[PDB]
């Protein structure tokens, strides 16, 4: 999997 941070917001792919 992968952890994404987009301008402070956390998401998982």
């Amino acid at each position, epitope marked *: *999997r*992968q*952890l994404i*941070n987009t301008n*402070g*917001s*956390w998401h*998982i792919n």
Partner: antibody
Amino acid sequence: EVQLLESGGGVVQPGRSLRLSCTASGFTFNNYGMHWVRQTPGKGLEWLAVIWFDENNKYYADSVRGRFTISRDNSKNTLFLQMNSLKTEDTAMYYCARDISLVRDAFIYFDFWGLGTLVTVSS
Amino acid sequence: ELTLTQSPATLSLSPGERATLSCRASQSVSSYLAWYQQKPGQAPRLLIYDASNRATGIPARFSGSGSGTDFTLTISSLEPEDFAVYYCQQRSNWITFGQGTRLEIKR
């Protein structure tokens, strides 16, 4: 039982570097994201960095980005925090913490903490 | 820049009573809020995550609720071990912590 063992604390001079380590036992380390968080009585708890399942997948607080590096060696079950260009303001208790890591669909919460390593930055 | 503010700063109670703690965010964090307990000279312990979910092994006497900018932790049937500091944490935008609420023994 779940265990996070941190390196012992001590003193380091301003400007120098210091690498902290945290070694996991009692669970499958590779399956968990990990974090470093520090604490001072004056400024409270401050998150510093996360590393996810893939060892190249990392994030950092604005305050330490480009100064600190987080890394993991899965074969040794060890998490590192490499701190460079240390200032007296970096004096703190340094905790490693395990992320809840998608267990029950949750992430970016600290479900297990080490006892901490006390770092004193002083000349 | 997201700030969490905890109240009361200090709570004075006796074992067996109920504590009610509050965490307020400067802007909405949806349900992205957790609560930690920290006993003196020890590591923090995760109590509640996603505002209302108990961490594995955490007793129901720790109960979390709220959303947006307003959150509450209640601790029922206080135990001797529960007199400690409690912190909230958001993960809506980066990761920040409240400044803590101190629970002490009334006399």
